[PDB]
Chains A and B, each alone.
Chain A
């Protein structure tokens, strides 16, 4: 089990780690998060007590180095940093544990929620979407735009999501305007899966990365990407049986995990009514249909 230590907590902030969250008071003696499960990506995220605008955070994998958080009072945010000196880091970490100024990643043993939300997300892929290759961890926030949004505005700080556009020549074969636009199977299976993502795993990795950015940072652009990647499978008459079964499972946990009071802004009435009720896959998402109907019947 791994640990992300904090130098200090100089400003009052709500700290998140994956689906968990802790209030830290201004200059509370907080020195980080311990017992972080090895084997998955994690996200540590921040909302300042004062400016509840700009939620921000850091995607990391503890296998890829020793990471800590330090408040920067010039730039006014909690910064993730790599400690290259390993012995200095063991030493920093063991002190704070003995003094018990660290909260423990609070994992219920029966609970597989995080695995289920990050199953296909891999740090190698996150770093291609968020390009800053001199760090082994990726900074995301609420206001960061997507490469697509930037088309329709600083390229360094974009989210580089795979562009998906139902009304593009990428999506529409010359001579199959009607076939390709009402059954998006070629766009899904040949252009995106065979062509760009290579396999279903990488496709689901980006879908899941996009949802979590939508949920944890209310990143509008990530919400659109999640919806777009859901609509492309739902509007494809031809999809492998396993992708539908895994999609049903992916959506189930994302719908289950959503805060009850954010359906208004994170869920797109049209895409869901279409996926669940009108699309080719109206009868392929039993689990997602059941939870959506029982938990958000207002939307449909």
Chain B
């Protein structure tokens, strides 16, 4: 069943597992019609499928063409997510296939269970964690590849860059969530913190700046502060 902080180290053991976040699959701008009514305009989305051990992000770009002439789209999006996760699993060799898929939202349990009837040795699990994967479109390079896509397409990213050469998954995942939580709380402040020093660049094949160990600590400290500031302000506390 469900995943929480009591069984947190499970994510970093040697069972292949993926997180699936569907928050960014169906995205609309809401706008006024000439007649003064409201209409939505869908924009490209993406499925956030992440192996928390390796940092591999199977980023499936959902192109606005998939919604054309379809009804009840927020419901279709959960099922389009399930279809795409199934296909990615089926395209992977047996020894690469996940032993578990953890959905960040409970409304994905059934759509995914049903698409994986053929994989009854794969456990479909919800989580009680509040993971910030919704903020993945605040990562510039991810937003760019999604907005520019003219067709369905899938880009293998490594959302930990080369971090694993210096740190453990546990720590890399915690750093990732600390950054995503920052970006989701205050995207402006969060990103100002990441690029206030032009000397520190993002490698072409990376998502985050090439920070030294010391610089990460100072970035990680600045990100924790930001998250309290905005909380004490959300709440006046």
Interface residues in chain A, defined as those with a beta carbon under 8 Å from any beta carbon in chain B:
167-169, 172, 177-178, 181
Contacts and interface: CB of A to CB of B under 8 A. Distances in A.
Range for the number of chain B residues in contact with chain A: 10 to 19
B117 A169 contact: yes
Given A167-B117, A177-B79, A177-B82, 6 more contacts: A167-B110, A167-B114, A168-B117, A177-B111, A177-B115, A178-B111
21 contacts: A167-B110, A167-B113, A167-B114, A167-B117, A168-B117, A169-B117, A169-B118, A172-B114, A172-B117, A177-B79, A177-B82, A177-B83, A177-B111, A177-B114, A177-B115, A178-B76, A178-B79, A178-B111, A178-B114, A181-B110, A181-B114
A224 B151 CA distance: 46
A177 B111 CA distance: 8
Contacts of B83: 177
Contacts of B82: 177
A181 B79 CA distance: 11
A183 to B, nearest CB: 12
Interface in B208-237: none
Contacts of A181: 110, 114
Contacts of A178: 76, 79, 111, 114
A137 to B, nearest CB: 40
A59 B108 CA distance: 45
B101 to A, nearest CB: 15
Contacts of B114: 167, 172, 177-178, 181
A137 B82 CA distance: 49
A167 B117 CA distance: 8
A181 B83 CA distance: 14
Interface string B125-167: 0000000000000000000000000000000000000000000
Interface in B78-133: 79, 82-83, 110-111, 113-115, 117-118
Nearest to A174: B118
Contacts of A177: 79, 82-83, 111, 114-115
A168 B117 CA distance: 7
A169 B120 CA distance: 11
Contacts of B118: 169
Contacts of A168: 117
A172 B83 CA distance: 13
Q: Which of B82, B114, B115 has the most chain A CB atoms closer than 10 A to its own CB?
A: B114
